[PDB]
Amino acid sequence: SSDICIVGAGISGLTCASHLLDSPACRGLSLRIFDMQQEAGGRIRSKMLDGKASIELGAGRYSPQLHPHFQSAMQHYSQKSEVYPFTQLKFKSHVQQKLKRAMNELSPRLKEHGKESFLQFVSRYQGHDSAVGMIRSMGYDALFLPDISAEMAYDIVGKHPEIQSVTDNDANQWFAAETGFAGLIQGIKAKVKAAGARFSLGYRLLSVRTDGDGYLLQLAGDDGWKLEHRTRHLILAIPPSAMAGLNVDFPEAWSGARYGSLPLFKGFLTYGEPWWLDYKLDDQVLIVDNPLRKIYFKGDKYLFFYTDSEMANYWRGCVAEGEDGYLEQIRTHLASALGIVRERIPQPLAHVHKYWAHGVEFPSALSHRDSGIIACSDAYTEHCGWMEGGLLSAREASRLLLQRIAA
Amino acid sequence: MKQSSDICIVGAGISGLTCASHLLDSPACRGLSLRIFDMQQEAGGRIRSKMLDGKASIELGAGRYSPQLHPHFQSAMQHYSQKSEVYPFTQLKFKSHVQQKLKRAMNELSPRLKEHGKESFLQFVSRYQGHDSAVGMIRSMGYDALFLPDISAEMAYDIVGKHPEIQSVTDNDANQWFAAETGFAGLIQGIKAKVKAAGARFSLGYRLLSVRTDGDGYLLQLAGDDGWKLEHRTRHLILAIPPSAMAGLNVDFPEAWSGARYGSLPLFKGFLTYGEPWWLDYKLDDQVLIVDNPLRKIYFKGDKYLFFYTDSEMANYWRGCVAEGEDGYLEQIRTHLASALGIVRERIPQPLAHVHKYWAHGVEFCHPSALSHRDSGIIACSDAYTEHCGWMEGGLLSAREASRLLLQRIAA
Ligand SMILES: Cc1cc2c(cc1C)N(C[C@H](O)[C@H](O)[C@H](O)COP(=O)(O)OP(=O)(O)OC[C@H]1O[C@@H](n3cnc4c(N)ncnc43)[C@H](O)[C@@H]1O)c1[nH]c(=O)[nH]c(=O)c1N2
Ligand SMILES: Cc1cc2c(cc1C)N(C[C@H](O)[C@H](O)[C@H](O)COP(=O)(O)OP(=O)(O)OC[C@H]1O[C@@H](n3cnc4c(N)ncnc43)[C@H](O)[C@@H]1O)c1[nH]c(=O)[nH]c(=O)c1N2
Ligand SMILES: [Cl-]
Ligand SMILES: [Cl-]
Ligand SMILES: [Cl-]
Ligand SMILES: [Hg+2]
Ligand SMILES: [Hg+2]
Ligand SMILES: [Hg+2]
Ligand SMILES: [Hg+2]
Ligand SMILES: [Hg+2]
Ligand SMILES: [Hg+2]
Ligand SMILES: [Hg+2]
Ligand SMILES: [Hg+2]
Ligand SMILES: [Hg+2]
Ligand SMILES: [Hg+2]
Ligand SMILES: [Hg+2]
Ligand SMILES: [Hg+2]
Ligand SMILES: [Sm+3]
Ligand SMILES: [Sm+3]
Ligand SMILES: [Sm+3]
Ligand SMILES: [Sm+3]
Ligand SMILES: [Sm+3]
Ligand SMILES: [Sm+3]
Ligand SMILES: [Sm+3]
Ligand SMILES: [Sm+3]
Ligand SMILES: [Sm+3]
Ligand SMILES: [Sm+3]
Ligand SMILES: [Sm+3]
């Protein structure tokens, strides 16, 4: 049993646990935290690549200008940051240069035509085909969705480091975690644990029912063992896709909005020599019209690519066919991306990859209209798709729960 | 990119791997592609061997076999050059009064088996000295499944006689028992390597979700550990998975397969290693203790380690104990070990390392040795369909039949 139960040990659930444990208003209550995975962090996942190279299979960068709450958290938990170099396109193509002119020249038309789709909006510059080539050169295939409006896309573009240069956020700075964002997760977890909260990792919430003034949760361990938990206050710090698997009538009984998701894929490769130094590619990012889409060269340490939507599924399908075919395709697409023959690309010594079926999903926190369960996720904020959104939702979720306790 | 095969086997346990080996050896089957799925990242299923701390091979799943009862398993160990060793837990060195009394009771009651052998084991034994005495006797066998109302006296007599710790209760001492010198995982890997070298393709980490007939073949929907959906087309399908897994699919199990029903029980094993073999002072090495105590069955493996093995409610008890935290779980073992050994709690030290495994459906039970879908022709393979339900020998027997059933389909 517990007074307060949080389902989800991502940055959102851990942060709202920290807020509640700090509050002098509800001191002494027991706090129980569940997560279906054996480790906290959710879509924050830091790994060591072969030798001594820390890499981010999930969230990777932040901007102090856009994400003040996240910068504050990094400093609060004494987490060191380092410069994130992939904030400009050094070898801009013609279509990328033309994109900048189109974005700025069409920008005043956002006032009256901001609601139409981004593709249709950009088509005003030189027609459909030209718009496709320009939008493609930003490396985020989500921008082609018909639901994303022009003003919505301008906001999205202005938030990403590789392409911010085409917006009024072109002065924003970007950083990464020196040791990986896992260090921040573990910092919050240790503080929450030292304060007396109980963690039950490896238990998935299946269903919830109202039990008088509290709730009865049905969970299952990853070995199938069924567990029941009673709580007085419940926060679901899980993304919308996870809410759909529950029996809580999401989103109908929570808000008047709908939610969607897109897959994401990252692949990291190390080599015997930093061969890309010969092409002056260290600390540069290339956005290309081939399945790699976005290629990054981190100093002299490793390279990686990052894609979404259909290309993420393509690479995951490529992994399911075998490692040899997977690395072969990477080698082919690296060669064409660099404009050189395949034989000049070496073979890697080690590699790791990660596929997120719902890597990105889209009031800062929600409440069930009848039961009072609180829902916490970046998808409910103006920073959907960003760790900052989780912190904003967590602050609002803890505020909602404190009002529930004080009532 | 498209996934397709002539033959698909879902399940990389001993049953699925063996029927793959049979099919690859068949001359009337050469040239066909074979694809093998399993939801786990490693083959073996309920065979799971691990290294406890330094150098100590332990069996979190299947642990022992008898060459008298399980000749196909013995032959497989030999065929793949897997060395065996004596399984020492075959006698009760400290027979309790209730254990001695149950042997006498089952003997003296045996003339009543003809007329009353169909009633529950508990009710049958109750005819000796009443209900309470029967509970005490049956409890001392260490297998709580024997209390189930669906386990008849006739069934229990056979069950008692085929388990190493209590086989002496029905004078079945002629059964030798062996374990793997390096773990039964070595046998699994031996089969897998043979199957892989023969051309079969393994896709581990993919769980079958549903199956639909697709003309003369089948269309499979699978999901990887990361939620990625995989579609696979095959012509011939063997589901080498237990009944509980079959019931999770959309293949009308067991209605379209047999007239029998199927059940399961949970199992739990816990292993502990210490800085010294403290149990040697009590002459417990290579001995097993059966106790009216949540540990139920306590084993001491030479001077290497000890473990306990439980089923049914006590399996769930220890799993809930794990959920409370390692400290409370280890201290609960310490308390129950002291009570079982009749020694002071402080005399038992704390373990250096430990590991445990909970099998929600550790044993599955219920008539040919393999089944077929009366409409779609899908083949099912499991130890639960054999007279050796709950034993690896059953998987080997089911695989023989399943392979013959598929070869018939291929030749039709
Ligand atoms: C590849 C990639 C790249 C990026 C990013 C993501 C990904 C996948 N992000 C987004 C960022 O990772 C994201 O916004 C936050 O990590 C979300 O944190 P939450 O805790 O809200 O959800 P998150 O998904 O992290 O955690 C939810 C937790 O709930 C658990 N859970 C779900 N259902 C459950 C159930 N039924 N029972 C029990 N537990 C359950 C899950 O296991 C999970 O641990 C990012 N952001 C950013 O700021 N900068 C960046 O550069 C990027 N880049
Ligand atoms: C604790 C304990 C102790 C013992 C035993 C079990 C346990 C749990 N057994 C019984 C023995 O483990 C059992 O008889 C065989 O291992 C069963 O082999 P199968 O391959 O038939 O099923 P098994 O369950 O081993 O394998 C089935 C495989 O199918 C896979 N699968 C299931 N559904 C799937 C899906 N939808 N998609 C993809 N894959 C799927 C599973 O992941 C699994 O690998 C035993 N026997 C014995 O002879 N002597 C002994 O001492 C013991 N003791
Ligand atoms: Cl995901
Ligand atoms: Cl007596
Ligand atoms: Cl199981
Ligand atoms: Hg609290
Ligand atoms: Hg509190
Ligand atoms: Hg491939
Ligand atoms: Hg491929
Ligand atoms: Hg959103
Ligand atoms: Hg939260
Ligand atoms: Hg074959
Ligand atoms: Hg064959
Ligand atoms: Hg406990
Ligand atoms: Hg306990
Ligand atoms: Hg059976
Ligand atoms: Hg089989
Ligand atoms: Sm042009
Ligand atoms: Sm206008
Ligand atoms: Sm997901
Ligand atoms: Sm994004
Ligand atoms: Sm394929
Ligand atoms: Sm006696
Ligand atoms: Sm007596
Ligand atoms: Sm009579
Ligand atoms: Sm508890
Ligand atoms: Sm099971
Ligand atoms: Sm048994």
Side-chain angles (χ1 to χ4, degrees), chain B residues 96-103 105-114:
Chain B
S96 73
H97 162 74
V98 291
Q99 291 170 339
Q100 300 166 351
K101 187 167 61 173
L102 179 58
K103 178 166 185 172
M106 292 180 66
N107 180 47
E108 298 177 16
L109 294 175
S110 63
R112 308 185 194 185
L113 282 169
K114 192 183 193 303

Side-chain angles (χ1 to χ4, degrees), chain A residues 198 203 223 225 316-318 320, chain B residues 1 206 226 228 319-320 323-324:
Chain A
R198 171 172 173 174
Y203 296 87
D223 57 3
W225 184 70
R316 181 57 177 81
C318 195
Chain B
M1 258 141 50
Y206 290 91
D226 55 8
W228 182 71
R319 181 57 177 82
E324 294 300 72

